[PDB]
Design a protein around this ligand. Structure first.
Ligand SMILES: Nc1nc2c(ncn2[C@@H]2O[C@H](COP(=O)(O)OP(=O)(O)O)[C@@H](O)[C@H]2O)c(=O)[nH]1
Length: 488
């Protein structure tokens, strides 16, 4: 209990992972009224804690930076549409999460409307996402018949009042599971069905365990409706109680704890499109340790220069930050994704990655050609990834979300003189390739040369025609490693 450590102990940093249309926007909004650009990251008080919520843009905004945002959090909330179950992007974002086995909290949403069998929703999570479920609450009816939820550990029933949503409902609680007031509130039909279903839950599901939760191996499961603002506070109570305070982060040199003074942090995201009053392209940095104050002098390790940061975007609940918080650095071409910042100590954080792009095309000028110089530089920042096959001169751009393609053409025109045009190519993914046996490694290069390419950072990567072709290369050259991810 020493003022600075007090501020570290009470912070909780998380982001939502969800499929588009599942309810991130609705539940984020409701989360904020329980706490009483800025949308990027929002800090609010809840109970005795200070909670940092990072946006994970999933619509037209979707990009590789959405994935990288998850590297900068210590906890995620998986929001599932309880009518649709586990969807594609749900699976993709959990995938990203397994890089650090980040703890997950689950919120089954849209209980206003009819849903899939809740026991099946649990099943779906376990068999598809490889994580145990632990129901904390359990729904009592659904649709027009949604009456509320039951807490398995507090032995009580929260009662749902329809048509609230834009306020915080009155909390109404019946205490016994076997209290006849539960039957009077909900009907004996749904009260008996609760009791029978809890029996199946005990027989086929898992008790909550804080240890496994922190190891990324179970998740508490909450049921509610974000539109009607019910059960969101139930999930925030788990968040506060169970999610970690600012966790450590690994470096090339050592493990950095948040309990250290000395400011320390890394950049995980750079805003696409420069608007504000200039080209700020705000670089978002996660504070790993120490306190940022306004006039402070930091070390940009990449360039080995001292930078005074007088203006720094802050997302308060004035102009300070503690570990767990996010900072927006003003950037005019000097910051890059993965840039570490300290107060002199020269080391590099080692979590911030480059994911296998999910979308590809060939870039090309309608002539002639410093287009290469421009893609390599955009690649050094966050903008995109480029691939230069060994056997030819083509340039292949690799994005995660379509938006990135448009951004490259614009920035190529403005910051470099080039006018660039896209062309379809046959590429389904890439994998960075690696082999400690020089003899087997060169035999692999020789026999697969037509599918091999170089990064904008000179890392060798197999460019796969289809996933079937990737599985073939993998199984025929088992001594070679195919990585879906690499350090940026
Ligand atoms: N009935 C019902 N509809 C919801 C609920 N939450 C969100 N919606 C609706 O589902 C749609 C998607 O919501 P949205 O928050 O934009 O999902 P997002 O894409 O993850 O941000 C919208 O038309 C919402 O009105 C829910 O609690 N119950």
């Amino acid at each position: 209990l020493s003022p600075y450590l007090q501020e570290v102990a009470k912070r909780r940093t998380f982001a939502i992972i969800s499929h588009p249309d599942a309810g991130k926007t609705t539940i984020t909004e409701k989360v904020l009224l329980f706490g009483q650009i800025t949308t990027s990251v929002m800090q609010f008080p809840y109970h005795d804690c200070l909670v940092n919520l990072l946006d994970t843009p999933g619509h037209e905004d979707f990009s590789e930076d959405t994935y990288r945002t998850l590297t900068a959090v210590d906890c995620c909330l998986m929001v599932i549409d309880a009518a649709k179950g586990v969807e594609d992007r749900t699976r993709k974002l959990m995938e990203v999460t397994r890089l650090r086995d980040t703890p997950i909290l689950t919120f089954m949403n849209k209980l206003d409307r009819d849903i899939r069998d809740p026991m099946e929703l649990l099943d779906e999570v376990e068999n598809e996402l490889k994580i145990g479920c632990a129901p904390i609450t359990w729904p009592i009816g659904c649709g027009k018949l949604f009456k509320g939820v039951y807490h398995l550990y507090k032995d009580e029933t929260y009662l749902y009042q329809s048509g609230k949503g834009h306020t915080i409902q009155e909390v109404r609680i019946v205490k016994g599971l076997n209290n006849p007031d539960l039957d009077a509130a909900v009907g004996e039909d749904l009260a008996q069905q609760l009791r029978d279903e809890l029996e199946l839950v005990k027989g086929a599901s898992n008790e909550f365990d804080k240890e496994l939760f922190l190891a990324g191996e179970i998740t508490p499961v909450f049921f509610g409706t974000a539109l009607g603002n019910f059960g969101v506070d139930h999930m925030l109570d788990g968040l506060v109680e169970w999610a970690p305070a600012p966790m450590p982060r690994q470096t090339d040199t050592r493990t950095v704890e948040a309990s250290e003074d000395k400011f320390t942090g890394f950049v995980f995201k750079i805003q696409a499109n420069m608007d504000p009053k200039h080209r700020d392209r705000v670089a978002f940095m996660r504070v790993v340790s120490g306190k940022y104050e306004k006039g402070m002098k930091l070390r940009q390790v990449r360039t080995a220069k001292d930078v005074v940061i007088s203006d720094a975007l802050t997302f308060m609940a004035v102009e300070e930050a503690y570990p767990g918080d996010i900072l927006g650095l003003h950037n005019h071409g000097t910051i890059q994704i993965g840039d570490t910042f300290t107060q002199g100590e020269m080391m590099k954080f080692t979590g911030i990655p480059n994911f296998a792009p999910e979308l590809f095309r060939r870039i090309r000028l309608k002539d002639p050609k410093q287009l290469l110089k421009g893609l390599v530089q955009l690649s050094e920042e966050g903008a995109v990834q480029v691939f230069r096959p060994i056997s030819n001169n083509d340039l292949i751009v690799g994005a995660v979300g379509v938006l990135q393609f448009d951004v490259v053409v614009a920035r190529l025109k403005s910051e470099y003189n080039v006018e660039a045009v896209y062309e379809s190519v046959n590429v389904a993914t890439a994998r960075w390739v690696e082999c400690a046996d020089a003899k087997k490694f060169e035999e692999f290069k020789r026999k697969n040369e037509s599918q091999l390419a170089l990064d904008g950072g000179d890392n060798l990567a197999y460019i796969a025609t289809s996933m079937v072709n990737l599985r073939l290369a993998q199984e025929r050259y088992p001594d070679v490693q195919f990585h879906q991810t690499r350090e940026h």
